[PDB]
Design a protein around this ligand. Structure first.
Ligand SMILES: O=C(c1c(F)ccc(NS(=O)(=O)N2CC[C@H](F)C2)c1F)c1c[nH]c2ncc(-c3cnc(C4CC4)nc3)cc12
Lengths: 311, 228, 227
């Protein structure tokens, strides 16, 4: 490594302890950052504390039977099936298996509706209602663009590097909200990610919290924790950058034009132990650092300055 | 004038804050109340212009107080520090005169007043680190009046989880710990604001979940540090 | 006095404020005496960061205009010119300093390569900004200086030397990025990597971890260029 003094505006989080960072060093090769306090213990295999202040800032739900038109079975699994339909316009329907639940199951369904009507983040799939009369179902918005899994393997080749990163940015910006609401999305996968219009990502399959072919996206420890979701997000990154499917994944497969800042970000998320992994508030921060540096440090490498720091 | 607003937006992306601030100041001089977007630009502009000097001063002052005995060297560092401080002072004074001349006099709603007053309470806490002698006490007293005044309006008009209120507790609590050297008086203010937002957590909203949850991490970080 | 100004410049190294760092070293050079190697880096890094700020800023404002294409862009245009008119002044002051004071009194091997390579860079930085006709006049000058240093260096410097590889790295980038000659640039770097590694032990403990960094810079450029 070769480091330099750096004072950070906007936001940053030390790569060692990951607390808010305002004045420290960084590595010019990879962009690593750290406080002076923890500099003495920074790894070298390159492949009087003070206080911090304020940083900068930038029943009617139910649907009676027969109102919803039912189309063709798009897919089935878990404990239900998905159909396209029309109800006040285009809609999608998850038909759960049970038609005559027990009161305990119904109340569990009642609580889930109580939760699912509160979440209204842009990067999650909009909730439109439910129905118990014909069968247990939840009505959502319909996204024309198929799952992200369909856009890498069936129709593909339509992703620039900037757009490729932006998809993993909105994936974390939507899963940060699911952690700020204390919901663990157990089964994140590229097939649970959708693209509505002009590529606006939407996350799904996080419902059925009360009740709650996937081998690739299952975490090694999968068993459930916030750390487990980070690994699943790590695997989604691998498919994006490499353009392939997983199978550790070979990081070398990544494109040439993706900077090493993303190389290190992905490596952390795929860390074997739960503890070492970052959390989504920080992942969403580095990826917005990695996104501010595309229109700025696109180049063929020049000459760096000699090491101007010693620890 | 929107030309100034976009010029500042251009300047922020280019990362030229000394030019960004010169634009937002020209907006504030026009006598109209800033929107909550223009208002949040004036905060980012000046907190980066000052944040540079605070960083320069905190390193020069540590170069001094080191290598004891080398009088000729320690004479050079000493004279350099006081050059930074005068430049640092000129910024804080410009901010404070800007608050008290245009913004605070015309802050109608509670949200704005709790906002501008906290700024006033912040820029005096910056001078209290630079000044010395009777002037330090003359400044530190002036800071407390602004922090206290905003705190009263916040307790009454704004929700527990609102980031503006939840940040006034963070900056005010620090002022008790560092400037006044009163850990217990700081901890009580920190713990009180922390729990009130935890109790009424579900009032959190899509437009403020990330901003508010960050400050609660900063607020919790200081508590553990102080109690360490 | 010179010794005083070196300290007053290393006070801006730490705690940044590189605009003050430039003023100290600039006056140091005007004395006419030859700068020591340590005193030579301070003038290098003092300007490396003053221009590096406008280079980065100019790129961002450039990407914005290309994306908006419109009174918004009509104003964003004049702001890009504002950064450009600063890069011109910073480059001119280094070149005049190099031409009038440093280069004439070099009188040593490593010094001659250093100043000419530096003269080469600060002409290239004008190419990235200048228009067609001005680019051609600027592009030629960056090559004469680069070539002239390219001659002295290969004659006199060791097989491995940070200044030797640093000139090959910057000269190839000039070909690939300014002259659009990818194979012309590819060969230059390829030989530099081969020659240096063939005799890597010519380095020593004081600079091997300094030169080895440039070798990774050369290898990565080829990998990007081979793709
Ligand atoms: O699958 C669901 C769905 C659902 F309908 C209801 C519930 C849940 N889960 S939930 O209850 O957890 N949920 C969390 C947020 C929400 F509020 C409730 C679902 F996952 C879809 C919703 N809209 C969609 N649009 C398009 C596609 C689609 C497109 N292309 C293909 C390719 C094969 C061709 N296959 C499928 C799938 C859905």
């Amino acid at each position: 490594h070769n480091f330099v003094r750096k004072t950070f505006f906007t936001l940053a989080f030390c790569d060692f302890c990951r607390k808010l960072l305002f004045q420290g060093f960084r590595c010019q090769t990879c962009g690593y950052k750290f406080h002076q306090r923890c500099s003495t213990e920074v790894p070298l295999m390159c492949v009087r504390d003070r206080s911090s202040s304020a940083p900068n800032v930038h029943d009617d739900w139910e649907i009676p039977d027969g109102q919803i038109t039912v189309g063709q079975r798009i897919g089935s699994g878990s404990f239900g099936t998905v159909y396209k339909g029309k109800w006040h316009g285009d809609v999608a329907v998850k038909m759960l298996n049970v038609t005559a639940p027990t009161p305990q199951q119904l109340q569990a369904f009642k609580n889930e509706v109580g939760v699912l009507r509160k979440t209204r983040h842009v990067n999650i799939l909009l909730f439109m209602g439910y129905s118990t009369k014909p069968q247990l179902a939840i009505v959502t918005q319909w996204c024309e663009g198929s799952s992200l899994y369909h856009h890498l393997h069936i129709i593909e080749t339509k992703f620039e590097m900037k757009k490729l990163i932006d998809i993993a940015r909105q994936t974390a910006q939507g899963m940060d909200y699911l952690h700020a609401k204390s919901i663990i999305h157990r089964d994140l996968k590229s097939n649970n990610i959708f693209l509505h219009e002009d590529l606006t990502v939407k996350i799904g399959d996080f419902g059925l919290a009360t009740e709650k072919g996937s081998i690739l996206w299952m975490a090694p420890e999968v068993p459930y924790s916030f750390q487990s979701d980070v690994y699943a997000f790590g695997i989604v990154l691998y498919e994006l950058m490499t353009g392939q499917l997983p199978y550790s994944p070979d990081l070398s497969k990544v494109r040439s034009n993706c900077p090493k800042a993303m190389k290190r970000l992905m490596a952390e998320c795929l860390k074997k132990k739960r503890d070492e992994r970052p959390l989504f508030p920080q992942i969403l921060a580095s990826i917005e650092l990695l996104a501010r540096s595309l229109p700025k440090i696109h180049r063929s490498a020049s000459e760096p300055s000699l090491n101007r720091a010693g620890f | 004038k929107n030309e100034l607003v976009q010029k500042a937006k251009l300047a922020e992306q280019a990362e030229r804050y000394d030019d960004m601030a010169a634009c937002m100041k020209s907006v504030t001089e026009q006598g109209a109340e800033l929107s909550n977007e223009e208002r949040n630009l004036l905060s980012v502009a000046y907190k980066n212009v000052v944040g540079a000097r605070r960083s320069s001063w905190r390193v020069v002052s540590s170069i001094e107080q080191k290598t004891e005995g080398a009088e000729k060297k320690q004479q050079m560092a000493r004279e350099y520090r006081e050059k930074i401080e005068t430049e640092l002072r000129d910024i804080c004074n410009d901010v404070l005169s800007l608050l008290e001349k245009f913004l605070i006099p015309n802050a109608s709603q509670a949200e704005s007043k709790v906002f501008y007053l906290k700024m006033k309470g912040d820029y005096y806490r910056y001078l209290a680190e630079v000044a010395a002698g009777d002037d330090k006490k003359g400044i530190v007293d002036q800071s407390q009046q602004a922090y206290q005044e905003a705190f009263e309006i916040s307790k009454k008009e704004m929700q527990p989880t609102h980031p503006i209120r939840l940040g006034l507790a963070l900056n005010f609590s620090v002022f008790y710990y560092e400037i006044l050297n009163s850990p217990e008086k700081a901890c009580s203010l920190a713990k009180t604001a922390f729990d009130e937002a935890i109790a009424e957590l579900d009032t959190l909203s899509e437009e403020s979940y990330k901003d508010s949850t960050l400050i609660m991490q900063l607020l919790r970080d200081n508590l553990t540090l102080w109690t360490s």
